[PDB]
Amino acid sequence: KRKVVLAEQGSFYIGGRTVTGPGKFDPSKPVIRYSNEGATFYINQMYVNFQAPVRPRGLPLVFWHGGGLTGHIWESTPDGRPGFQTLFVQDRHTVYTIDQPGRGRGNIPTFNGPFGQLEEESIVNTVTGNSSKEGAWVRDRLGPAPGQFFENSQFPRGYEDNYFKEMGFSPSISSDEIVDAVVKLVTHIGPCVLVTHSASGVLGMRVATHAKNVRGIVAYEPATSIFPKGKVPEIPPLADKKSQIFPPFEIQESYFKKLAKIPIQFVFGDNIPKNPKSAYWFLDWWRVTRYAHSLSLEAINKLGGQASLLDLPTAGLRGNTHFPFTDRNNVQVASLLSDFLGKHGLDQN
Amino acid sequence: KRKVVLAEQGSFYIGGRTVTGPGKFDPSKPVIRYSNEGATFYINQMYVNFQAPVRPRGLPLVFWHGGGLTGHIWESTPDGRPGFQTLFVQDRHTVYTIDQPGRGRGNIPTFNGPFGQLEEESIVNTVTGNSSKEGAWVRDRLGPAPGQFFENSQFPRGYEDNYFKEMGFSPSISSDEIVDAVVKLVTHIGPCVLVTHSASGVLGMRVATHAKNVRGIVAYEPATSIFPKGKVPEIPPLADKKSQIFPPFEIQESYFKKLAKIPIQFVFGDNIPKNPKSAYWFLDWWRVTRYAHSLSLEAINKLGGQASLLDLPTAGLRGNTHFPFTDRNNVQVASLLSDFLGKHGLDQN
Numbered sequence: 026k027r028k029v030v031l032a033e034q035g036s037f038y039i040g041g042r043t044v045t046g047p048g049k050f051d052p053s054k055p056v057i058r059y060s061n062e063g064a065t066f067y068i069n070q071m072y073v074n075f076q077a078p079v080r081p082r083g084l085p086l087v088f089w090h091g092g093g094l095t096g097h098i099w100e101s102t103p104d105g106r107p108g109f110q111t112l113f114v115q116d117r118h119t120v121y122t123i124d125q126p127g128r129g130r131g132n133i134p135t136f137n138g139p140f141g142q143l144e145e146e147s148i149v150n151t152v153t154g155n156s157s158k159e160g161a162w163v164r165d166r167l168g169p170a171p172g173q174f175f176e177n178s179q180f181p182r183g184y185e186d187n188y189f190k191e192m193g194f195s196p197s198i199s200s201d202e203i204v205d206a207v208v209k210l211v212t213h214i215g216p217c218v219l220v221t222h223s224a225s226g227v228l229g230m231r232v233a234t235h236a237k238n239v240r241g242i243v244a245y246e247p248a249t250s251i252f253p254k255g256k257v258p259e260i261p262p263l264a265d266k267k268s269q270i271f272p273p274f275e276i277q278e279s280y281f282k283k284l285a286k287i288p289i290q291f292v293f294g295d296n297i298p299k300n301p302k303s304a305y306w307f308l309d310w311w312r313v314t315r316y317a318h319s320l321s322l323e324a325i326n327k328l329g330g331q332a333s334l335l336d337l338p339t340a341g342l343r344g345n346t347h348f349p350f351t352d353r354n355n356v357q358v359a360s361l362l363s364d365f366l367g368k369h370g371l372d373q374n
Numbered sequence: 375k376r377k378v379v380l381a382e383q384g385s386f387y388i389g390g391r392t393v394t395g396p397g398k399f400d401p402s403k404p405v406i407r408y409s410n411e412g413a414t415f416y417i418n419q420m421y422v423n424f425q426a427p428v429r430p431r432g433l434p435l436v437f438w439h440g441g442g443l444t445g446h447i448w449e450s451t452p453d454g455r456p457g458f459q460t461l462f463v464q465d466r467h468t469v470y471t472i473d474q475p476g477r478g479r480g481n482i483p484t485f486n487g488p489f490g491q492l493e494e495e496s497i498v499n500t501v502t503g504n505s506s507k508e509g510a511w512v513r514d515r516l517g518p519a520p521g522q523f524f525e526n527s528q529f530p531r532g533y534e535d536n537y538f539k540e541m542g543f544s545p546s547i548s549s550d551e552i553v554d555a556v557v558k559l560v561t562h563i564g565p566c567v568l569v570t571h572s573a574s575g576v577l578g579m580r581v582a583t584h585a586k587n588v589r590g591i592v593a594y595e596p597a598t599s600i601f602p603k604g605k606v607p608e609i610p611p612l613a614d615k616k617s618q619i620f621p622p623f624e625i626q627e628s629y630f631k632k633l634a635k636i637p638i639q640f641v642f643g644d645n646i647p648k649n650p651k652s653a654y655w656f657l658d659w660w661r662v663t664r665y666a667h668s669l670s671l672e673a674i675n676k677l678g679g680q681a682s683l684l685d686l687p688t689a690g691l692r693g694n695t696h697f698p699f700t701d702r703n704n705v706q707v708a709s710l711l712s713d714f715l716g717k718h719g720l721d722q723n
C-alpha cells in the first residue's frame with residue numbers, strides 16, 4: 026500500500042560555517058558580474074527533511090544515505106516502489122532523511138573561481154573523483170561483472186538507468202564537518218536511531234560517540250571498519266595479495282567504549298564469497314570488509330556492548346544487493362529493521 | 375494546518391544522457407583506486423518528487439525552483455512553516471517538485487580529473503560562479519543593503535542563516551539540456567501547470583513552446599525576458615547608464631506563438647522602485663527587468679494570448695520579497711495562485 030498520513034512534514038538546513046572574500050560589498054555597484062569581493066558564503070551545511078505520522082510511537086529514525094547518494098534512496102526504489110521513508114512512517118515512526126554536506130541538497134562549497142577555491146584558499150579540491158556505472162555495478166554486487174546478475178537477484182532488473190542516475194560525486198569535505206552537522210541534528214531532534222549505509226556507516230558510529238541521543242544504530246553494509254586506536258587486528262590483503270580494504274578508522278578508546286552502551290546491528294546482503302576470489306576484485310573486497318566488521322563488532326562486544334551482524338540469507342532472504350532497502354524484497358528487509366527496533370524498545374514511547 | 379493525506383508519494387530520475395571514458399573495464403583489477411578507464415557516466419539527469427492527494431482534482435502542478443535553489447523552497451519556509459507543496463496537496467492537487475540538472479539532487483557532471491573535465495573534453499567549466507549572502511540579500515529585496523530590512527518586509531526575520539543556506543552554485547550545463555529534461559517530465563506526466571521562479575521563468579516558457587501538455591504558467595519574478603526573434607523592443611540601461619538587465623532570450627515566432635494558447639501570469643512582490651535608483655543596483659535592476667517582462671507579456675497578448683502581470687501590492691499584499699511563496703504571508707500568496715488555477719479551469723476534472 027502506498028497511502029501515507031502525515032501529521033506534518035517539512036525540511037530545513039542545519040550545520041555548516043561561513044567563509045568570506047576580501048573587501049567590502051557596495052550595493053551601488055553591479056552585483057551580477059558576481060565576485061568574491063565583500064562576499065560571505067555559507068558552506069558545508071546539511072539538508073534535512075522529516076515526515077511525522079499521526080500518533081508517532083518510539084524514537085524518530087534518521088536515514089543516512091551511502092557514498093555518492095542522497096535521501097532519494099529512502100524515498101523510492103528505482104522501479105518506483107515505496108522506500109523506507111514511506112514504510113516507516115506507516116510503521117508510526119517519525120522519519121528524518123538527510124542529504125549530507127557535499128551531496129544533493131547539502132552544500133557544495135564553491136565560489137567564483139576554480140572549483141572549490143576561494144581566492145587563495147582551497148576549501149575543497151578542484152580535482153574530483155567519481156565512480157562509474159561499471160564500478161558501481163560490481164561495488165553493489167548486482168553481478169560479478171557489468172551487465173551480469175547473480176542468480177535469484179533482488180535487484181529491480183530493467184531499472185538500471187533509474188538506479189545509476191541517483192549516484193554522483195562528492196567534493197573533498199572533511200569527514201569531521203560531516204559528523205559535526207549530524208551531531209547538531211541529533212542534538213536538535215533528541216533521542217533517535219541512526220540508520221546508515223555504506224560510507225555513512227563509520228560516520229554514524231562517530232556521531233554516536235559524540236552524541237548520547239543516538240540510542241541505536243542499524244548499518245546497511247558499512248564500508249569502513251572502526252576500532253580503538255592502536256588495537257586494529259590483523260586484516261589480510263585481498264586475493265590479489267596486493268590490494269587492501271579501507272584503512273580502519275581509529276578512535277580513542279574512551280570514545281570507542283560509548284559504542285558499547287547502545288544496540289548496534291550491521292546488515293549484509295547476499296553474494297559475499299566465503300573464500301578468496303581473485304577474479305572479482307569487489308566481491309573479494311566485500312569478503313574482507315565484512316570480516317573486518319565482524320572483528321569490530323566483537324571488540325565492541327568485548328567492552329560490554331550489544332552489537333550484532335545480520336546476514337540477510339541467514340534470515341531467509343536471498344539475492345540482496347548492497348542496497349537491500351531498495352531491492353525487490355525491501356518490505357521483508359524493513360520487517361527485520363522493525364524487529365530490531367521492537368526488540369530494544371525503540372518503537373515504544 | 376499541517377496534516378496531509380497522500381494516496382502515494384515518491385521520487386524518480388528522468389532525462390539526461392551518458393558519456394564514456396576511454397578503454398575497457400576489468401572487474402579483476404582494483405575498482406576503488408577510481409579513474410575514467412572503461413567508465414560510463416550518467417550526466418545531466420533531473421530529480422523529481424511527487425505527492426498525490428486522495429481524490430485529486432484538476433491538473434498536477436510542477437514547481438520549478440529559481441536559480442541556485444532546489445525543491446526545498448517549495449517544501450518549507452526558512453522559519454519552518456509549510457511550503458507550497460503541502461499547501462497545494464491540501465488544495466487537492468498532485469504536486470511535483472524538481473531539482474533541475476546541476477542543482478541539488480539533479481546531476482552535477484564531473485568525473486576523475488579537474489571539475490567538469492572528462493579527459494580532454496570540458497563537459498562543464500572548471501571555474502564556477504556563485505552568489506554571496508550580500509548579493510542574494512539585495513537580489514531578493516529583503517532590504518536595500520545587506521543586513522537591512524524594508525520596514526514592510528514579509529521576510530521571516532531571525533531565520534536568515536536558514537534562508538541563505540538553501541542557495542548554491544550551478545555548473546555550466548547547457549540550458550537546452552535543462553529544458554530537455556523538463557520536456558521529458560511533462561511528456562511523462564501529461565497535462566500540467568508549470569509554477570516557476572526567477573531563473574526558471576524563461577526555461578518554463580521554453581518548455582511550454584515544446585510541450586502542449588503545459589496548460590498554464592505562473593512565474594514568480596522571472597529573471598530573463600523572452601521575445602520573438604528580431605522583435606526585442608527598446609529596453610533602457612540601468613540608472614548607472616552602464617549596466618544592462620539579462621539579455622532577452624529570442625525564439626522563432628512560430629514557437630513564441632504557442633505562448634498565446636495558454637494562460638500565463640507573472641507575479642511580482644514589493645519594493646521595486648518606479649523611478650531610477652542609481653544608489654541600489656539590484657533595486658534598479660528589478661525596475662527595468664519588470665518593465666521588460668511587461669513588454670514580453672504585451673507581445674504575447676498581441677498574438678492573441680492571455681498573459682497578465684500581477685503586482686502583489688495591488689492585491690493588498692505589501693512587503694513581499696523575491697520569494698513570495700516562502701514569505702510570512704505565503705498562505706495569501708497561495709490563495710492568489712489557487713484563484714488563477716480555478717478561474718482557468720485548471721482545478722477541475
Ligand SMILES: COc1cc(OC)nc(NC(=O)NS(=O)(=O)c2c(C(=O)O)cnn2C)n1
Nearest residue numbers: 035036037038039075213214450454455536
Ligand atoms: C521545517 O521543519 C523543521 C523541523 C525542525 O525540527 C524537527 N526544525 C526546523 N527548523 C529549525 O529548527 N530551525 S532553527 O531554529 O533555525 C535551528 C536550530 C535552532 O536555532 O534551535 C538548530 N537547528 N536549526 C535548523 N524546521
